[PDB]
């Protein structure tokens, strides 16, 4: 239905179709089909906040050519 | 015993010694405090106080208790963290509460954090523009092309990028999937820049362990919509010490500002002079903790 790009790990952008009713979960597997990077390990950030796993892309109200940022997690402790 | 949750300690340390931060959770705190005398954000906004005033009286001659507040905000935080991921959260619950209060100084994120990106696309058939309005609390660079600078690592990140291939954009003028060229550029500078290099990558997660030479003073003018006149300098760098990046344990490293870097080791402070700091930075050292977050202030 509409169009967002994905900043990746080094940079490059891609592209993903996506519905303004589409949950996290489904954007992230998606992401994994182009990047090879499993949804439990992916963190994205839209206009500086995190999406949650559960709510949909009419939550954080992103909109065509929306622009999201992939990054992991470094854990340490 | 306090440095197993260092990914919660070193993050404090930067937001305390942060410019501005801390007048600003005290300014809240009294207006919190006040209706109080007159629930669980204001507990962050109390919580974070307390800490600040208990490592203001140890210094003049508790991140367990942020932690509990955390594992209400947040059902994770209750294991090794990421070091960033937290700093969303005090980051953004402060805000949170703000947006509340205000409704009941106001801006402690919004002024100090937040920033504006214009991101615009050129289609390579029409060529035509199209733009948007972002907000950004930190530029997620990366560190390797797949000795380099920062300045390749924010080019990378801001620079003109050719989508190509698979990853056409669909341009609504042509109605036809089209080459574009994107270019984000920052509009509005916030007071402290933060930088999250990219140190992960992926093939089979692993860390790449060859840092950038990072540079003491960045001006972010070349990426910028406006002539700008302003420069930034480095206060701050979070570092993750490991192997993998499933495991591992961070530090910190915070100017002085009489002019030297305090290195956070547990529950450990080293006094570094600025030369010999900025050696341990190098990549031809090979720095065992490699960098992560980068903190600029302006001048
Ligand atoms: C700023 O530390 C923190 N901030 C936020 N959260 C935290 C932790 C979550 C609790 C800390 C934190 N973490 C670890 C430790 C270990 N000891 N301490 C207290 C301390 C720290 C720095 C100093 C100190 N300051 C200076 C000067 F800069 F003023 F010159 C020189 N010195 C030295 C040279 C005497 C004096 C006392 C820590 N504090
Ligand atoms: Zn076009």
């Not at chain 2, 410019?19 to 919190?32: D, E, Y």
């Not at chain 2, 523009?129 to 380099?148: A, G, H, N, Y």
Request: charged letters at 25%; aromatic letters at 8%.
């Amino acid at each position: 239905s509409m169009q967002i790009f994905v900043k990746t790990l080094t940079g490059k952008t891609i592209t993903l179709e996506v519905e303004p009713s589409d949950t996290i979960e489904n954007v992230k597997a998606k992401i994994q089909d182009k990047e090879g990077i499993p949804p439990d390990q992916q963190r994205l950030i839209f206009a500086g906040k995190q999406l949650e796993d559960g709510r949909t892309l009419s939550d954080y109200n992103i909109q065509k050519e929306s622009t999201l940022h992939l990054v992991l997690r470094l854990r340490g402790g | 015993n306090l440095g197993n949750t260092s990914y919660l300690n070193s993050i404090l340390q930067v937001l305390y010694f942060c410019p501005g931060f801390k007048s600003g959770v005290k300014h809240l705190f009294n207006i919190i405090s006040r209706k109080k005398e007159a629930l669980a954000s204001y507990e962050l906004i109390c919580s974070l106080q307390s800490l600040i005033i208990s490592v203001e009286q140890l210094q003049a001659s508790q991140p367990r208790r942020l932690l509990n507040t955390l594992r209400e905000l947040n059902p994770m935080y209750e294991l090794q963290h990421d070091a960033q991921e937290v700093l969303q959260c005090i980051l953004g619950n402060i805000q949170e509460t703000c947006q509340l209060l205000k409704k009941e100084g106001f801006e402690l994120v919004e002024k100090l954090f937040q920033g504006q990106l214009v991101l615009r696309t050129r289609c390579l058939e029409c060529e035509s523009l199209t733009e948007r309005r972002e907000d950004f609390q930190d530029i997620s660079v990366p560190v390797q092309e797949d000795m380099k600078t920062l300045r390749w690592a924010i080019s990378q990140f801001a620079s003109v990028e050719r989508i190509v291939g698979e990853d056409k954009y669909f341009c609504e003028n042509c109605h036809h999937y089209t080459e574009a060229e994107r270019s984000l550029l920052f509009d509005k500078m916030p007071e402290v820049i933060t930088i999250h290099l990219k140190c992960f990558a992926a093939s089979g997660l692993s860390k790449i362990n060859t840092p950038l030479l990072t540079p003491l003073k960045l001006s972010l003018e070349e990426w910028s919509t406006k002539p700008t006149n302003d420069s930034y300098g480095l206060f701050a760098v979070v570092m993750h010490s490991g192997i993998t990046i499933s495991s591992g344990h961070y530090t910190a490293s915070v100017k002085v500002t009489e002019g030297k870097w305090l290195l956070f080791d547990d529950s450990e402070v080293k006094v570094t002079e600025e030369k010999d700091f900025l050696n341990s930075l190098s990549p031809s050292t090979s720095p065992t903790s490699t960098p992560y977050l980068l903190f600029y202030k302006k001048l």
